[PDB]
Design a protein around this ligand. Sequence first.
Ligand code: GJS
Length: 438
Amino acid sequence: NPFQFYLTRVSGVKPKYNSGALHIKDILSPLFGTLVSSAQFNYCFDVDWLVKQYPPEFRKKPILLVHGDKREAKAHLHAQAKPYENISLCQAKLDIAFGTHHTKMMLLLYEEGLRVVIHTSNLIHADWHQKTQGIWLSPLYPRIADGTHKSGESPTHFKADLISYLMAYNAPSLKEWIDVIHKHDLSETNVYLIGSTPGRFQGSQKDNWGHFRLKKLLKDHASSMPNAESWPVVGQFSSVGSLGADESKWLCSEFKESMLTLGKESSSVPLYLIYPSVENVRTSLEGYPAGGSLPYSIQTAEKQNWLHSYFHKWSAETSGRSNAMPHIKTYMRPSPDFSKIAWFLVTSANLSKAAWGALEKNGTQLMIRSYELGVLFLPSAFGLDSFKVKQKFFAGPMATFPVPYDLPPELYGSKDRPWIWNIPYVKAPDTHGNMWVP
Ligand SMILES: O=C(O)c1ccc(O)cc1C(=O)O
C-alpha cells in the first residue's frame, strides 16, 4: 500500500483484525530503525509506561516530551519524568484561554535516517488497549550528505510545512528538531500536513492553519466533479465543543463551507457526524469507562440539542472494531454511494472551534486556541482522480483507501442519545457488570 495508514492493535478481537495493526512497541522496535533520539508530542503521558514501550536497548536514549500542562499538572509531569535522566520536557505555550496541546506525533531519529509518526493516541496504556486509533507512518527519510545542497522537499511541501508547524512553538528544544529535519530528505512524502497552532491569523497567514488550511489545500489540489453537491461530508470524532445556538453560527457556515471546497472555481451537501451513542459505549469492550475518553459535557450538549440530529452511531465491522470505541478523528468526502472518496484526513482535531478555528473581526481573522495535527490524503498526490473505498479494512489493487469504519454511517435511532460523560447511566449495566456514576 502507498498510504501507510494503520490502526492500533485491539486486545480481544480475532487475530485477523490485528494483522497489519500496530502497537506502540512495534513502532519503536529496532526493526523500524536504530534509535538515537525521539520526541513525543502528546496531551497525556504515563512516563513509566512510555519508557517500557521502548526496546530495552533504547530506553536510555534522549526523549523529549512536548506537552501543554501548566501549574500543578506541569509539576506532576515533571515529577513523573524526574527518575529518568534522559527525559527532557518542552511546555508548549498556550497563550489563548481554554487551549490545549492535542497534537500526537513522534519524531524518531535513527542511525539510518528519520521517521515521523502522526497518530491519535495518548501515551497511556488504555489508549492502545481497546480503542480504535489511527497512525500514519512516514517513510524512512535518509540523511542528506554533508556538502550536498538539495531541498529534500516533497511535492506536497511536507518538509517546509512540518518545520513551519514546529517553528510556531518558539521552543529551543524544537529548534534542535528543526535542524534535524533540515538535514534529511523528505521528498518521498505523499501526504499534506494540516496543523493548528494557537493564535489570531489574518491576511496570508489565515491559510496556514485549521479549517482555512484544509480549504486552501482542497482548492489547490482537488478537482470539483459534476454533482459535487451530492458528495457528502463525513466527520468522525471523540469530543464536541460548544458550536453555538444553531447550525448557522459555525458548523454549517464556515466549517462545512471549508470541508465542501473542491477546486478553484466559485448548500444541500449532506453532513454525517459519527460519534458514539450511549449504547455504543455501554456494550463496548471497555464498557462505560470508555466514556472517560469521550469528553462531551452535559453543560455543552444542553445548549446545542440541534446538533444531535446530525449524529450517527459508531460502527466498524469492516475492521472488526465496532466494540472498540473511537479515539481516532477522521474527515472525508465520499461519493453519493460511498464507493469512492475525494480525500481523507486523519487528525487529532475534534469537532470544535478551538481545534479548527473560528473567524473573528468581521471575517478577517481566524482564531485558534489549540495545537492539532493531521495528514491529508489527496488523490492527486497519488496520480489518481479519486480513491476507491476498501470494502474490508484488512482484506487483499493497492490503490483503494482503507476507511476504518462502515459506510454509509447509521443514523441514531429514536431511543439513542450521544455519549455525555458527566451524567449517570444506571438503567443497564456495561460489559463488565457496572453502571456509570460520575
Ligand atoms: O485525547 C486528547 O488529546 C483529548 C484531550 C482533552 C479533550 O477534552 C479531548 C481529547 C480527545 O482527543 O478526545
